[model samples]
Target: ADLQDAEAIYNKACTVCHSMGVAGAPKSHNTADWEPRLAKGVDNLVKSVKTGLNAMPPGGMCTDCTDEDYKAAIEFMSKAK
Candidate 1:
């Protein structure tokens, strides 16, 4: 996956749960919700997405997304302070 295309990939795969905080997923751009997760660092977040966590399936439904893409998606959604 192209690193620059993270937002587009997010729209496709991550939006469903994240946009609404469905299944306890942190809502997109919610710093309070994301802070705890981000505290674990980007690498761990990527690992969670890659290996699956809670209601999220492996790859977070983004089968074609690379780790860089996942990182981008995480940062985009996290918008941490």
Candidate 2:
């Protein structure tokens, strides 16, 4: 999905936690916050989101999203602001 499509999902779901780092979620658009997590690889990140990491509920509120969708959302949130 494009960033535009990813933005839709980010705004709808990821924003709640990621926007302000809720429950230790990395803030959206904060490369500093996301870079470390990136070391695990994007696919692993998706796996974490799918499996429920820490305080994040399974799917991280992305009930209707695919793995690629999650990747897109993550890219949208992690890239430079």
Candidate 3:
């Protein structure tokens, strides 16, 4: 996966909330922070990202992204340690 692309997307769209862990978002590269969300199962997390969770906009503001892209992005980020 082109995680660089995913990182670019998240840096712009996701970093706003994620960098600070705002609204319970996982901070970048925080393995512990990602663990809980990961426990929810990757599929469920992907679904939530696609459909939007509380306070998060649908597709996480990536209106240009497809479900597969979102899945790749989530998978890339969740694996950060």
Q: Which has the greatest TM-score?
A: 1
Per-residue lDDT of 39-66 in model 3, one digit per residue for the tens? 6666776667768888989877777776
Question: How do the candidates rank by lDDT, highest first?
Answer: 1, 2, 3
Tens digits of lDDT, candidate 2, 1-81: 223477787887777777787777667776676677776666767777777777887876666678666787777766322
**Model 3 stretches astray by more than 4 angstroms:** 1-4
Residue 66 lDDT in candidate 3: 64
lDDT of 3 at 36: 77
Candidate 1: lDDT over CA atoms? 0.73
Best candidate (score: lDDT): 1
Provide backbone clash counts, one per model.
Answer: 0, 0, 0
Q: Any residue pairs clashing in model 1, and if so which? A: none
- The global C-alpha lDDT for each of the candidates, from Candidate 1 onward, is 0.73, 0.70, 0.69
Clashes of 1: 0
Worst 10 residues of 2 by lDDT: 72-81
The local distance difference test score of model 2 is 0.70
For each candidate, give its TM-score against the true structure.
0.81, 0.77, 0.71
